[PDB]
Ligand binder design. Structure first.
Ligand SMILES: NNS(=O)(=O)c1ccccc1
Length: 165
């Protein structure tokens, strides 16, 4: 009944940077929220720990969650390779929104993006399921290692991850 919280400890070429925590809107998108929560604890035997943020575009978003091919072409959900667009109740209102990457309708896997700007053109195409609670300043620090074409200038990794009380 309380929306769960998850944390990522970020590292930059293997050096600790800081912690970002997220509220997951299990009250609005329980299935999408649950996928991200379980990938964050690793309780299914796979998930986000050790994975990288492969695409970071300043003024736009930080993209991660491809834990099988590390480049935007892989990942899987806890339900099978892909699952459906749960609903589009939540909109891309500004920095800190956590939303699902996909390749067309009903193609959610494990990849996600953290918005660093309002991205309303994504409304109704990408499922918004969470938001940064603590450490937006760490997200901004990550963001500086991106570039216009999304290539990062240092390796940005989820050193550790899990669920908070
Ligand atoms: N390239 N399409 S995507 O699902 O990865 C995506 C869309 C919008 C923002 C970040 C990521």
């Amino acid at each position: 009944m309380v929306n769960p919280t998850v944390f990522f400890d970020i590292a930059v070429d293997g050096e600790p940077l800081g912690r970002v925590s997220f509220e997951l809107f299990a009250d609005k998108v329980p299935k999408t929220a649950e996928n991200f929560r379980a990938l964050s604890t690793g309780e299914k035997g796979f998930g986000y720990k050790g994975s990288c943020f492969h695409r970071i575009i300043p003024g736009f978003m930080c993209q991660g969650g491809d834990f099988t091919r590390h480049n935007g072409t892989g990942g899987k959900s806890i339900y099978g390779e892909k699952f459906e667009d749960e609903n589009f109740i939540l909109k891309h209102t500004g920095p800190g929104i956590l939303s699902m990457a996909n390749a067309g309708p009903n193609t959610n896997g494990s990849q996600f993006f953290i918005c660093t700007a309002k991205t309303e053109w994504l409304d109704g195409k990408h499922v918004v399921f969470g938001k940064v609670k603590e450490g937006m300043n760490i997200v901004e620090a990550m963001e500086r290692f991106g570039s216009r074409n999304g290539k990062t200038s240092k390796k940005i990794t989820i050193a550790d991850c899990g669920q908070l009380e």
